[PDB]
């Protein structure tokens, strides 16, 4: 069934998905572009964009809610100072999914998820 049940299970625990998408969102912000499969890319897109949505307004309250998620100040410091200002006027897609190829090991369709505006 799963009629209108937008969320992807990823063959894992729910306690694993909260920590996989926490550490993978963390390495996307520390770096600027990472490499993973599409089904993780289409889903990381659902977690990292609500952070760039969040850090457009700095406050003590917004730092906490951005610290419950991602659980590390370095990502919180990378947010609110870099990304918030760097994606200010744009209202929408703060990241880009880009298909590349496959892995030698398990043949998984991969993609380079990237934050937009990286022509520095």
């Amino acid at each position: 069934m799963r009629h209108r049940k937008s969320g992807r299970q990823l063959n894992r625990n729910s306690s694993h998905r909260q920590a996989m998408f926490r550490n993978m969102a963390g390495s996307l912000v520390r770096h600027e572009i990472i490499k993973t499969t599409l089904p993780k890319a289409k889903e990381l897109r659902r977690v990292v964009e609500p952070l760039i949505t969040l850090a457009k307004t700095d406050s003590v309250a917004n730092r906490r809610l951005a610290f419950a998620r991602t659980r590390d100040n370095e990502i919180v410091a990378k947010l609110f100072n870099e990304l918030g200002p760097r994606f200010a006027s744009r209202a929408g897609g703060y990241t880009r999914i880009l298909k590349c190829g496959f892995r030698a090991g398990d043949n998984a369709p991969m993609a380079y998820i990237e934050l937009v505006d990286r022509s520095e």
């Binding site: 572009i33 298909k99 380079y112």
Partner: protein, 56 residues
């Protein structure tokens, strides 16, 4: 649940009728380098839609 009589080569081939592989055969040349690749996939060095998207 085992089997009763041995199947033939005929039955072994008719079953592998639909196991036959299929190629892509219709690639796209990029606007910049023209290196052939898959539709909606980056090149070997980082070109995509006539643009170095790997930025490296």
């Amino acid at each position: 649940a085992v089997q009763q009589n041995k199947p033939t080569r005929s039955k072994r081939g008719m079953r592998r009728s639909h196991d036959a592989l299929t190629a892509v055969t219709s690639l796209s040349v990029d606007k910049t380098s023209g290196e052939k690749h898959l539709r909606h996939h980056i090149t070997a060095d980082g070109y995509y839609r006539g643009r170095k998207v790997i930025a490296k």
